[PDB]
Amino acid sequence: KVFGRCELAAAMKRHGLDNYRGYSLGNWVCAAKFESNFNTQATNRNTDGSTDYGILQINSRWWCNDGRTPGSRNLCNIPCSALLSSDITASVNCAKKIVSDGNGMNAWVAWRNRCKGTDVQAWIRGCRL
Ligand SMILES: [Cl-]
Ligand SMILES: [Cl-]
Ligand code: NA
């Protein structure tokens, strides 16, 4: 599913990402934008052989099992394919585990490089939340 900008913000708010660990909704929306362009089916091979999955490009190196990433962990205890579902529950629930690791939203390379410090509020502008 390719989510609309406000449509995704609404799903993310309902799952409790608005200010999760101090990160305002706008940050989660911006991250999604640049990680997957709001496309739940997005998959991208990392140079280390791991793959990133879903709307928030959760890494098979540490977070979900895809059976082809040697020596990796499956910290969210899910098959990476669960992260490509039209329903973002699984991706969100896991992102909550990732953003809590101490390694805040910096674990999302695109967020660090393209959202951090910016006016992430613009990402929710005009949305009924
Ligand atoms: Cl594996
Ligand atoms: Cl933080
Ligand atoms: Na894995």
From Swiss-Prot:
Compartment(s) of residence: Secreted
Recorded GO MF terms: beta-N-acetylglucosaminidase activity; identical protein binding; lysozyme activity
Pfam families listed in its UniProt record: Lys
Any one biological process term the GO annotation gives: defense response to Gram-positive bacterium
Keyword Iron: no
Residues at which substrate binds: 101
Family: Belongs to the glycosyl hydrolase 22 family.
Note: Lysozyme C is capable of both hydrolysis and transglycosylation; it also shows a slight esterase activity. It acts rapidly on both peptide-substituted and unsubstituted peptidoglycan, and slowly on chitin oligosaccharides.
Subunit structure: Monomer.
Protein name: Lysozyme C
UniProt source species: Gallus gallus
Gene: LYZ
